[PDB]
Design a protein around this ligand. Structure first.
Ligand SMILES: OC[C@H]1O[C@@H](O[C@H]2[C@H](O)[C@@H](O)[C@H](O)O[C@@H]2CO)[C@H](O)[C@@H](O)[C@H]1O
Ligand SMILES: OC[C@H]1O[C@@H](O[C@H]2[C@H](O)[C@@H](O)[C@H](O)O[C@@H]2CO)[C@H](O)[C@@H](O)[C@H]1O
Ligand SMILES: OC[C@H]1O[C@@H](O[C@H]2[C@H](O)[C@@H](O)[C@H](O)O[C@@H]2CO)[C@H](O)[C@@H](O)[C@H]1O
Lengths: 146, 146
């Protein structure tokens, strides 16, 4: 089931992991360019959604407020999770927000392209990335409107 | 996780429900044109897959062997589940085969367009159709290669 509370197109938000409380950032300098962060609110943690239409219906691109790049999640090459210019040129720029079946207030950030979800954990390494497999709590996210 | 054993493109198969053991048919006369069936093998129970490309990656159109129509699964009009010509012209002609997280040998037939899965049950009515909500075993299917 699609997450029922997806931010309106163009509305800005942070993506915060339910359990770690860490947020995703997407920046242009100092790798990793996309990772998780536990610290002050900064602009590179701010995103908006591009609403998919046509074959992208019920999918979304996740666009950085300060730099305009969209997220990608892939398994073809490292890094698995990163950013790229544009507004969803590539298939792995498109995400589904899938409501958790036990906690209706959180969702997974799912890639149809790579059949992965994003995760945030404190251990083991890598502490942030994407994953194909069972439904763990460390895959659960919130939208945090700003 | 996508079902790991999706029939090769162009290979033929029946779609059989795990619990009821009923098969899907897709025909051109005598409504319902797409429904479930408990009886002898007939050609209108035979399907092949069109493999989704580009924005349809990891999605599939389910095409009838004898009549060539593709399945649809929608919530926009009645009937919810049916067939149509055009080799996947409409978004609701595209399906993801999602492995069950407890039974690795079955999958759900999921519509990204309508956020529904196909189900098969003996009761209550409607006995066959689509559904958005919790996971139930009557949503689970097998590919039966011919
Ligand atoms: O949407 C991501 C997109 O990335 C492309 O590869 C990029 C790569 O991420 C970057 O490090 C490099 O400098 O430029 C490449 C542009 O081709 C992939 O080709 C594409 O499939 C997607 O994965
Ligand atoms: O992919 C299905 C497609 O159906 C269209 O509606 C059909 C309808 O199913 C049929 O009974 C009628 O005779 O013709 C209609 C138009 O082709 C929908 O318009 C479309 O959105 C899809 O749902
Ligand atoms: O996987 C199907 C699921 O269906 C639920 O029943 C639905 C029913 O199909 C629909 O016609 C009605 O409007 O809503 C019902 C409740 O959501 C069953 O409750 C469930 O057990 C499954 O059979």
């Amino acid at each position: 089931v699609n997450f029922p509370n997806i931010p309106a197109e163009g509305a800005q938000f942070r993506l915060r992991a339910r359990d770690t409380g860490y947020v995703i950032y997407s920046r242009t300098e100092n790798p990793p360019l996309v990772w998780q962060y536990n610290g002050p609110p900064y602009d590179d943690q701010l995103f908006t959604l591009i609403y998919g239409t046509g074959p992208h219906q019920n999918l979304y691109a996740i666009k950085s407020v300060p730099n305009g790049r969209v997220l990608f999640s892939r398994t073809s090459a490292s890094p698995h999770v990163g950013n790229i210019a544009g507004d969803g040129t590539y298939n792995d720029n498109w995400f589904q927000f899938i409501q958790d079946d036990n906690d209706p207030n959180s969702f997974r950030i799912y890639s149809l392209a790579s059949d992965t979800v994003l995760y945030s954990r404190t251990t083991p390494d890598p502490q942030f990335g994407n994953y194909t497999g069972a439904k763990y709590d460390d895959q659960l996210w919130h939208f945090e409107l700003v």
